[PDB]
Nucleic acid binder design. Structure first.
Ligand SMILES: [Mg+2]
Ligand SMILES: [Mg+2]
Ligand SMILES: [Mg+2]
Ligand SMILES: [Mg+2]
Ligand SMILES: [Zn+2]
Ligand SMILES: [Zn+2]
Ligand SMILES: [Zn+2]
Ligand SMILES: [Zn+2]
Lengths: 36, 63, 61, 129, 196, 89, 229, 152
RNA sequence: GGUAAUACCGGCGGCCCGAGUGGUGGCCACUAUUAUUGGGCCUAAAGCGGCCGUAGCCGGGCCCGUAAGUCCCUGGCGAAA
RNA sequence: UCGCCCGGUGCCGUAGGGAAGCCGUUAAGCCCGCCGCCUGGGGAGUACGGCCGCAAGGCUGAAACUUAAAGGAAUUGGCG
């Protein structure tokens, strides 16, 4: 997914393993719900 | 003086071994890669082992 | 200011490189002779380089 | 692999003399290397040198005097016109005649100070000061 | 030649070294025992003791240092200090003796004698900072870094540290006119060594 | 491209509020009673151009560089700023 | 040039010397500034310099480069400290730079000025530029460079009349040493004045590590220390 | 370093600098040419002819004598063989490499999951092609020749 | 800047340029923040997960030729402003 | 068991380099080569397009706008 290790640093954010999983769900909804 | 790193020189010699059951005189190598046998009779003179051979005759010189 | 060779600068007796104002050099009279003064720069003292007196032949540390 | 036997020599010389050595061995010995030693000698930077043959391209023994600050190779080997020397002398050397700049002119190898007397140019190969 | 007979250098153990080498000491080593323990030269210990004696007899006698932090080389430091006019500091060399003028023990020498450059490295550093020659007793394991005159000698045993300082203290007398001949030094060697 | 523009014959200071320079120029203006500052920088430039000319004829060598060298002395002493014995340096 | 020659006589009498160099200077064996340097001595009394270079304390051979105040934390507040950076030198060949600390601005300046004298060095001057080829001690005789911290400094010779075109603090240091013309090239962060100052100091010291033949001297004008006061 | 691995390694043979044959030799040039030709007809590789001359007959390398028919060149084993017509029909470097990549190619036909051996095959073929490019360039190999593995 | 403002708004002093002096937009230097001269890539931005190879750039020592690159001298040119 | 030469694998360490932590002939040193990537923090590895995969997914990859810091190596304390 071409990610950058600056974001696994957790200081003022949430975890990135869990932002990935949430971007993937939207990239799905834009695909099925008439992504054609 | 004159380090080995410039003009390298070997560590192995040419011998002038002399046979046992043949009397013949020859020249051989000290670190052979084969089985040096006599040039008339056929008995071995040196044997190949790793680094330096283990000769089996009488030496006359180191040449 | 009366420049008749007002001074000269000392040089190391092994390499010939003159000595900077504040380094850990040394000088002393030649052992075994007593007639020559011997200089050693900091870098020839640190890696122990041999010297030899310019008058007799006595050598090294 | 090996690409330049002259650069290796000049870096070896300036690395050795910086720690106090009094002899070096320039192993792969061209005659360009010998020709540049010849002009490093006439200006008083090295002592005496000899060519020793070893069956494979020969070696060079040279004695140092602790009289050089820096030596190196001008690599891309630019060309120079006979009236454009100062532009390069202001780039490599530290004052208006401090040291030599070695030039591969069409009449041999020489320092730029003797090229300006004949008025010729050529390729720059190295510099010593 | 041979300030003492060879059977007396060897009897002390001046020549016994250690199981560690160094490229600096490579000219003072002599061979290797099959045990793996190096042996020093003795002709060189002699020919260096003479030079060290006639070099030290050129300073004003109240401006010498003998130092030792080991325990076996402390009584030979005081006797050497008393026979010549030199000064001696046995025990711990507390720092700032040559650098701090705010201390009661301030003293600036002209040379300094070091028994072991490894155990006595504080005084070695303080001597580098001041620019005075250094005369040291080197063993097979030490480096010659900053040493200006070396003396190859087993500098650890108890009977060898007394034979070195004895010879050095005698030869200093013979070179400044305090003595006529070498056999006019009537002080037995046992007075130098530390008692068991 | 574009045609010729007429240019200014003086130069302003790089920073306008350096104290050790306002202090140095406040003296030359009361001693000679010049009207404004732009009247003072013009003379500084008249001098800096001479100086920058002598720096180029000093490294240079050739046939006409010689001719340009001794036209600088000739005028520079026709103007009373040098004596009759002065060399380029 | 006398007002600083009765100062020497006054100090040379009520000063009881405690090291060897002080003894030598008091007994008239050492009598010039130029012969305490290239020998490996140690300089621990500031009065070796008030007697051999008296005009070093002339209030126009002194300079205060910066004043800072710094802090350390504790369960009862903030413990504050000063830091002065000072340099001294006669404008002929000799310069020194020191720092010194305290709790007040006055004590800190005193220590700065004091330590500046003990960290003194002598340099070389000349003229090595391509444009001006005079032979006069007004600039640096050749290109030299020095470094400190994260600052890299290079100094290049320049022609006679051009100012000292270097940063804001380099002028003080270079002008106390006797230079008057230079060019410059810098890298690193030049806004930490301690490291920038110590880089310029290191360059002026490195002036005397370059090997030179006796023919270069009567081509660049190289003088060491005073050059005809 | 090595071509494919990167270990250094330094083992090799270190020769003395010398121009003329040694004094204790007694084999003249023709007595050595006959020796060189006698052994090839026992089926000996041009590398293993020199080993035997050096070990048993006591001849240090044959590159000490000049070429009898030519003062420029020096004598080499391959230049003796081509004098009699016995020299190989393909450079034997290439032949050894090609022959070693033919019984590895029938091992890899019964063990097709031996994935660590089939990398050595790719590396051998890389070497074969590196050599064919050079030989074609120097005219030792006719230009209508290609390494086709399905033959031999 | 929170009822004790050298920082806002007026008075009176002072400073910089001066027939000018300020405001908004654009390009260059500042910037070694585009790096041929002349930057970076362990922890700050940044070494492909690893290896094989086609084009291209870089290539060991000596001897004899050629004169394309390169260097010096000389004729015809590169309008005026 | 001891000594030496060559190649691998570890540690303490001179000169030197670095902002330091620390690297130091198994370089992060001084040189000669070739290729890949970097240009304040977010928006964003997103939208739109293309090529692969049976799908899950891989590879390529901007701008409107918004912000004055975001990052690194080490100090004195307070705290668990
Ligand atoms: Mg950068
Ligand atoms: Mg990173
Ligand atoms: Mg070539
Ligand atoms: Mg025109
Ligand atoms: Zn037999
Ligand atoms: Zn020296
Ligand atoms: Zn002597
Ligand atoms: Zn000048």
């Amino acid at each position: 997914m071409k990610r950058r290790p600056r974001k696994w640093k957790k200081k003022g954010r949430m975890r990135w393993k869990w932002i990935k999983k949430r971007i993937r769900r939207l990239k799905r909804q834009r695909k099925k719900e008439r992504g054609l | 003086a004159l380090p080995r790193n410039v003009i390298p020189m070997p560590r192995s010699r040419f011998l002038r071994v002399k046979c046992i059951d043949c009397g013949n005189e020859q020249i051989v190598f000290s670190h052979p890669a084969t089985r040096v046998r006599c040039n008339v009779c056929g008995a071995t003179l040196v044997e190949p082992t790793g680094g330096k051979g283990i000769i089996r005759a009488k030496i006359l010189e180191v040449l | 200011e009366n420049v008749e060779l007002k001074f000269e600068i000392p040089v190391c007796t092994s390499c010939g490189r003159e000595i900077t104002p504040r380094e850990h050099a040394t000088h002393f009279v030649c052992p075994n002779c007593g007639e020559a003064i011997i200089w050693r720069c900091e870098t020839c003292r640190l890696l122990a380089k041999p010297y030899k007196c310019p008058k007799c032949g006595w050598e090294g540390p | 692999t090996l690409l330049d036997p002259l650069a290796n020599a000049l870096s070896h010389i300036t690395n050795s003399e910086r720690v106090g050595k009094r002899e070096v061995y320039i192993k792969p010995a061209s005659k360009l290397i010998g020709e540049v030693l010849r002009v490093m000698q006439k200006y008083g930077y090295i002592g005496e040198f000899e060519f020793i043959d070893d069956g494979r391209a020969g070696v060079y023994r040279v004695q140092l005097l602790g009289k050089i600050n820096k030596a190196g190779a001008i690599k891309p080997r630019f060309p120079v016109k006979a009236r454009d020397y100062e532009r390069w002398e202001k780039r490599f050397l530290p004052a208006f005649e401090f040291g030599i700049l070695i030039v591969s002119t069409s009449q041999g190898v020489m320092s730029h100070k003797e090229a300006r007397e004949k008025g010729i140019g050529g390729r720059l190969i190295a510099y010593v000061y | 030649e041979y300030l003492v007979p060879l059977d007396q250098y060897l009897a002390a153990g001046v020549h016994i070294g250690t199981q560690q080498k160094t490229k600096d000491m490579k000219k003072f080593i002599y061979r290797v025992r099959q045990d793996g323990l190096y042996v020093l030269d003795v002709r060189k210990t002699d020919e260096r003791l003479k030079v060290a004696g006639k070099f030290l007899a050129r300073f004003d006698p109240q401006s010498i240092l003998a130092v030792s932090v080991r325990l076996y080389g402390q009584k030979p430091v005081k006797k050497f200090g008393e026979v010549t006019g030199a000064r001696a500091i046995p025990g711990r060399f507390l720092p700032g003796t040559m650098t701090n003028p705010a201390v009661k023990n301030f003293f600036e020498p002209d040379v300094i004698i070091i028994t072991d450059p490894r155990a006595d490295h504080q005084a070695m550093k303080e001597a580098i900072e001041i620019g005075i020659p250094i005369v040291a007793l080197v063993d097979t394991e030490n480096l010659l870094s900053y040493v200006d005159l070396a003396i190859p000698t087993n500098n650890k045993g108890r009977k060898a540290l007394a034979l070195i300082y004895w010879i050095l203290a005698r030869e200093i007398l013979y070179n400044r006119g305090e003595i006529s001949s070498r056999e006019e030094f009537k002080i037995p060697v046992e007075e130098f060594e530390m008692k068991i | 491209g574009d045609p010729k523009r007429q240019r200014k014959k003086y130069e302003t200071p790089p920073h306008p509020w350096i104290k050790e320079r306002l202090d140095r120029e406040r003296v030359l203006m009361d001693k000679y009673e010049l009207k404004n500052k732009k009247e003072l920088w013009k003379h500084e430039t008249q001098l800096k151009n001479f100086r920058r000319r002598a720096r180029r004829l000093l490294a240079a060598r050739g046939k006409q560089a010689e001719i340009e060298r001794e036209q600088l002395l000739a005028r520079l002493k026709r103007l009373g700023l040098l004596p009759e014995d002065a060399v380029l340096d | 040039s006398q007002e600083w020659k009765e100062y020497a006589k006054r100090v040379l009498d009520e000063w009881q010397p405690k090291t060897k160099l002080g003894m030598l200077v008091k007994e008239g064996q050492i009598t010039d500034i130029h012969e305490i340097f290239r020998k490996g001595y140690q300089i621990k009394e500031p009065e070796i310099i008030d007697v051999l270079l008296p005009e070093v304390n002339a209030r126009e051979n002194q300079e205060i480069l910066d004043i800072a105040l710094t802090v350390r934390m504790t369960d009862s507040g903030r413990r504050v400290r000063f830091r002065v950076l000072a340099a001294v030198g006669n404008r002929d060949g000799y310069v020194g730079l020191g720092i010194g600390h305290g709790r007040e601005v006055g004590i800190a300046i005193r220590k700065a000025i004091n330590y500046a004298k003990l960290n003194i060095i002598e340099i070389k001057r000349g003229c090595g530029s391509w444009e001006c080829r005079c032979r006069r001690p007004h600039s640096v005789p050749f290109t030299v460079e020095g470094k400190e911290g994260s600052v890299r400094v290079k100094l290049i010779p320049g022609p006679r009349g051009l100012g000292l075109v270097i940063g804001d603090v380099g002028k003080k240091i270079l002008r106390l040493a006797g230079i008057q013309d230079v060019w410059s090239q810098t890298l690193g962060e030049t806004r930490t004045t301690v490291n920038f100052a110590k880089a310029v100091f290191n360059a002026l010291y490195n002036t005397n590590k370059v090997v030179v033949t006796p023919e270069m001297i009567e081509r660049y004008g190289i003088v060491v220390g005073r050059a005809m006061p | 370093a090595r071509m494919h691995a990167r270990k250094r390694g330094k083992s090799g043979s270190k020769r003395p600098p010398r121009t003329a044959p040694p004094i204790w030799l007694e084999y003249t040039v023709e007595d050595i040419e006959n020796l060189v030709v006698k052994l090839r007809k026992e089926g000996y590789s041009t590398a293993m002819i020199g080993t035997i001359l050096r070990d048993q007959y006591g001849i240090p390398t044959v590159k000490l004598f000049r070429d009898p028919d030519n003062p420029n060149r020096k004598l080499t084993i391959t230049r003796i063989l081509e004098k009699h017509g016995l020299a190989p029909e393909i450079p034997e470097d290439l032949m050894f490499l090609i022959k070693r990549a033919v019984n590895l190619r029938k091992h890899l036909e019964q063990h097709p999951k031996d994935l660590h051996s089939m990398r050595g095959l790719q590396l051998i073929e890389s070497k074969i092609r590196r050599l064919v490019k050079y030989y074609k360039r120097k005219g030792k190999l006719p230009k209508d020749w290609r390494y086709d593995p399905e033959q031999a």
